[PDB]
From a paper:
The bulk of SLC38A9 are 11 α helices that pack against one another forming a TM bundle that transports amino acids and functions as an amino acid transporter. The N terminus of SLC38A9, on the other hand, was previously shown to interact directly with the Rag-Regulator complex to activate mTORC1.
Here, we report a crystal structure of drSLC38A9 with its N terminus but without the substrate arginine. Each asymmetric unit contained two copies of the drSLC38A9-Fab complex, arranged in a propeller-like head-to-head fashion. As with the recently determined structure, the TM domain of drSLC38A9 was captured in the cytosol-open state and was folded into the same inverted topology repeats made up of TMs 1–5 and TMs 6–10, with TM11 wrapping around the transceptor. However, instead of an arginine molecule bound, this time an unexpected electron density was observed, which extended along the solvent-accessible tunnel leading from the substrate-binding site to the cytosolic side of drSLC38A9. The density was of sufficient quality to allow an unambiguous assignment of the drSLC38A9 N-terminal section from Asp75 to Leu90. This fragment formed a folded domain, resembling a β hairpin, filling the entire path from the cytosolic side of SLC38A9 to the substrate-binding site. Electrostatic potential analysis indicated that the transport pathway in drSLC38A9 is generally positively charged, while the N-plug is largely negatively charged, suggesting that the interaction is electrostatically driven. TMs 1, 5, 6, and 8 of drSLC38A9 form a V-shaped cavity into which the N-plug inserts and is stabilized by several bonds.
Author numbering:
A (entry chain D): 1 to 133, 137 to 219
B (entry chain A): 80 to 83, 104 to 159, 176 to 221, 237 to 246, 268 to 287, 297 to 370, 378 to 453, 468 to 519, ...
C (entry chain F): 1 to 215
Write the structure that this text describes.
Amino acid sequence: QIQLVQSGPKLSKPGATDKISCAAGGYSFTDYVMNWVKASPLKGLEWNGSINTSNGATTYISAFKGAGSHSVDSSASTAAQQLSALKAADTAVYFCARNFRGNGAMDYWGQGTSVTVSSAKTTAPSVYPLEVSATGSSVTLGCLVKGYFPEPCTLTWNSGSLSSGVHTFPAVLASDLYTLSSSVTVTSSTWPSQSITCNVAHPASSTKVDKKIEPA
Amino acid sequence: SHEDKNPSIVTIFAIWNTMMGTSILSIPWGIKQAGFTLGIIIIVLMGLLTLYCCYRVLKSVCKYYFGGFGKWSSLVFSLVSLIGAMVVYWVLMSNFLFNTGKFIFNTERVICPYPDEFDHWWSKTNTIPFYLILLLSFFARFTFLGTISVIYLIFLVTYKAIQLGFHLEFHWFDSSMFFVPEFRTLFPQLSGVLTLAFFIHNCIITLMKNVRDLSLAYLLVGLTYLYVGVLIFAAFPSPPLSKECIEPNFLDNFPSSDILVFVARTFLLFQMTTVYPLLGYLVRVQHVFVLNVFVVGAGVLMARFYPNIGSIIRYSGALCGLALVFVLPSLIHMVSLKTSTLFHGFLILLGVANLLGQFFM
Amino acid sequence: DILLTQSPESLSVVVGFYVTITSQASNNITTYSSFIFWYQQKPGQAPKLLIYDSSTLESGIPGRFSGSGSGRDFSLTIAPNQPACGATYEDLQVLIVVRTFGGGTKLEIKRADAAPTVSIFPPSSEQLTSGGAEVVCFLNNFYPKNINVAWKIDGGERQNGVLNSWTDQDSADSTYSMSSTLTLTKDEYERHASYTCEATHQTSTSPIVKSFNRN
């Protein structure tokens, strides 16, 4: 089972550096090439440089010579890319990929590292449960997560049991603070008769909070 | 082929066709292992050095100088050349059969083969019909297939490069994904191949029995090797692929169904089969068929476990070339002298660093 | 550097129909076989390889994805369209030392029109006690993407301090959803009683209004 697992989201301060990793399980590491790719607002994919691990031979795109630095660890079968002195324009998602010489393209990819280049300091979120305002058929009830930074923010309903009827809207920035909201629509049979909770986790501020939706 | 009354012209031709054969297939991989520039230098020097040591053999079972530890010593290393060549014949007939047959079961590409329902990949399906034949020689009636293979093979290589051949860049000591450095630390691996490729010493005495002749012969031979080596290394599509992909049998950098290569493989298969039995008469002349099934068994076993043309040729050539090409012809000469000593010791040292440099990996 | 120009910019295909994304390369990307590749990327997820060497199908990809092309012009075709295909698709060239991608094609699956399940939510008291109050308003599972929400505080169209978010198109429903959180102060929230979440869409000429009174 070919698996590429990269690093966690990074909040690097403007002018600092970070190293992104990519642990490769499921194939013989050297029999393939490791590439790196950049995705920036909605559309715009850029090749970024790449390295044949057998002879340690990297090859970059001119645009990225001097930002990206490839390296590999043959024993750990991981690949690492260092980015240096970042600016606002370097806030992007970085992907890790896999190439065999020409007999294909980039067949297996990585989950993606999201680097956020900013000086706003990590603030933890405020979770507020959105109780329903009368009911009839089915009730949608919600949950508002307001005022957090950086963006890796994970929200589950009923610890994941409730996977269906969910709408986890993406985050927006207002005055260097994000706000996220989520809705779940269930039957008048199922609520308030059962327990429904908004589970919010901001790993970056070591914040794990649960918030139950109540009628008042 | 391989290692082992004339009006000079036919003498040079004969030395050429004898040293030509499946030996030329590994040259591209050798350059790649040293780097391009450093490899070219090595090919020239190693051509010149082996020529001097072949001269030396000409100026001389010999080996009275040593006796016992000399008579036996010449035999074992001469046996190393012979039995080592009977092994690589086995592997290459397998690959060529495999592709020659896979072709005739009912393609312009270059392949980076993944290193290791049709069951047509067997080296045992040829030992059964091919082992009695060396108990018997007449097979020398088909030496023309040696030239036919070499003729068609060279035609093949030129046709290919004309089609796709403009890809070079010069990363001198750094590396690129697609290009290897020009000076690579694996330069010893190239030297080992060349020793076995540049070896006629075991039979140059009988070959020259019919010196300007020899110099043109290795020059023609030496220049023949440099041609194939450079075309395949340069024409290897390098922006899309990489020059680290060059397989030790460069015909394996091509698919199972390259028609031109299949013609070359069929021709090489035709020629190669008409020459293995001779080595069986050759090995035993140097009382059951136990020895003689021993070399046959050695062929089959090698192709099924470790089938790299590159490692086999470099080790065997450096081994038998330690004595038969480097030290012994230099020892024969120096003792026969009952500044030059320093030079000839340096030749002795190269033959030593040749073998030791193959272990460094 | 090979510049790849991919069209359409944005494409809309009805479910069950055929989508023909196209790519054109500046230079030649054929070495001895063509070296363009097609990729699929759903929101927030890594890219997926559909067709390699312009016309060969990757193990596991549905045969409804087909590829053709050589030299300069290439096309990608999804012959029966499925809502699991609501993604953005790009093309890649692997032939020359600077590797380049394409403009991207955002495929939107046209489904039957559906109207929003609009639901309004008063400020949680846990916030009012911390100061501040926002009226969230979910508009879920609708089609098409375009929609307008007009917050009205005691009838007065208040458009200051509204903040929206849309979902990408559902991989199964082929629908969209939106959350409009109108944020006020605790003080200003208690200066008014009516809070309406007036939503207009293609489905109803008369806006679907969900409202509440503070008492």
